[PDB]
Amino acid sequence: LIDPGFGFYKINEFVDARDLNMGAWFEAQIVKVTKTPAEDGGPEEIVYHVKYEDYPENGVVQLRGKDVRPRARTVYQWRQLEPGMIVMVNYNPDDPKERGYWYDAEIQRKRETRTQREVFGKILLGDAGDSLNDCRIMFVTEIYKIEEPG
Amino acid sequence: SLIDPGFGFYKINEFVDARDLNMGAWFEAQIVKVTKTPAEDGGPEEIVYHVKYEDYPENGVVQLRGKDVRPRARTVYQWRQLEPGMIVMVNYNPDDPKERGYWYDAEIQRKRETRTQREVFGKILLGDAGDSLNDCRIMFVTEIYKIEEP
Amino acid sequence: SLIDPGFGFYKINEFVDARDLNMGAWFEAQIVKVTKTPAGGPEEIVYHVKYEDYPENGVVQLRGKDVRPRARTVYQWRQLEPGMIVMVNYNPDDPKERGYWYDAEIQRKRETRTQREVFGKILLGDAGDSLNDCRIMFVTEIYKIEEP
Amino acid sequence: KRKSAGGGPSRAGSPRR
């Protein structure tokens, strides 16, 4: 894999990339890495050009570093889930009891009932105003560690 | 929309929070009239706010002093903002402490994080003749409001 | 909001005046529950009330005669006349001092050395006997009694 | 809008008070 010379990923490296229109994370591939033009007053930022694996129709999308990270690999054991942790969960804003998309979430509470282990948290759906408190995370064995670039 | 009577802190038709003197709890209200009454000690004229409760028209119009009226609560604290000694508006049910209840001012006494959840404890301020409740567990820690001033 | 029990004069959560059975005077109250009780004939309505300022006295069962819409209108002096039944502030134990709100039958009124004075028969309902020839000390705060 | 439980305020207007 070719190193563009700067930034955290190589060309053709597989990454998780945020969808800028609905806030969830998706499997993607790095296709190009550039810097923002300085002509209009900056600031100079690294631009990661990605294509999304399951959505070729979205074409190549230009993302900033905060919208790209290494592919999720690690699921937390129950014991490792603690309030305040920022993790990646599967959640459906439209149909909250159902399978949805991969969103970041802040764990807020967890509990064992006589029926089941349960986790609630704040789903980070976009910007700070677009967050939802006390959402039940429906898939507690699929809560992923968020990876850091590098 | 809002009409300034020329005195007092609130406009006619302004939406405010009003405190019930017996309970110590705060309720959504609306200014209907503002009048003045002589001070007992020859000081500044005292302002009387005439309010109606938005969800309780059966209460009629109630006349309140400034201490029992304030702008409508609108901002919730983030967890990191909560500290012992802060006076904040919380939801609490004195009769059934585990359940949703009314909105009270509280002095935060302690916060902690357990393996299951974030916890906040506070001193609940009750009615004018009512004693305070110490070490009340505030069950709704993502719904703690900033108290507004005029 | 008010809730209609389907019978009687007052809604659940309606604010009213209600008699203290242990004193005879009238207190700000609120309807909690309305029920019926067997008589032998027409079922009688029971209004269950709580008193605004006396939560410690809980919910009390009253008949219609001991509940009425809350007082709201003061009489002007020129409106007061012997024979009228009105609501006054009176203290049976310290008659010159503020007390609580009793019904009264106005008996006499006059102006004495520039002071307006009103005398009347204080009524206790069935909490006790009436008190005759009482001086009503608070003549600017005499209220109209409301009806359902 | 705040979420609340229970009823309304205990005191209603009373001109005599």
Q: Which residues of A touch B114 (CB under 8 A)?
A: 83
Mutation site for A-interface testing, chosen from B118, B137, B143, B144 by largest number of A Cβ within 10 Å: B118
Give the A:B interface size as CB pairs under 8 Å: 23
DSSP B38: -
Binary contact (B116, A134; C-beta < 8 A) = no
Q: Quick check: B120 and B135 in contact, CB under 8 A? A: no
A6 CB neighbour count, 10 Å cutoff: 9
Contact between chains at D16 and C13 (C-beta distance less than 8 A): no
3-state secondary structure at position C50: strand
- Tell me which residues of chain B have a C-beta less than 8 Å from any C-beta of chain C: 22, 55-60
CA C91, C93, C96, C97: dihedral to nearest 10 degrees? Answer: -60
CA distance B17 to chain C (A): 18
**Resolution of the structure, angstroms:** 1.7
Cα–Cα separations (whole angstroms), residue A75 to A54, A147, B34: 22, 11, 60
**Hey, what amino acid is at C19?**
R
Q: How many residues does chain A have?
A: 150
Residues of B within 8 A of D16 (CB-CB) are none
For chain D, state the CA radius of gyration.
Answer: 12
Residues 6+ apart with CB under 8 A from B147: B70, B73, B87, B88, B89, B105
**Contact call for B57 and C14, based on CB within 8 A:** no
The residue to which tokens 């079922």 are assigned: C43
C104: left (phi over 0), alpha (psi -120 to 50) or beta: beta
3-state secondary structure of A27: strand
Cβ distance of A83 and B118 shorter than 8 Å: yes
Nearest CB partner across the interface for B58, out of C15, C52, C53: C15
Q: In angstroms, rounded to a whole number, what is the distance separating the alpha carbons of residues B129 and D11?
A: 14
Edge-to-edge strands, sheet with B46-53? B62-64, B46-53, B26-37, B15-19, B69-71
Name the DSSP letter for residue A120: E
What backbone torsions phi and psi does residue A22 show, to the nearest 5 degrees? -135, 0
Set out the domains of chain A in order of their start, with CATH numbers. 1-73 (no CATH), 74-150 (2.30.30.30)
Report DSSP letters for B48-91, one per residue.
Answer: EEEEEETTBGGG--EEE-GGGEEEPP--BPPGGG--TT-EEEEE
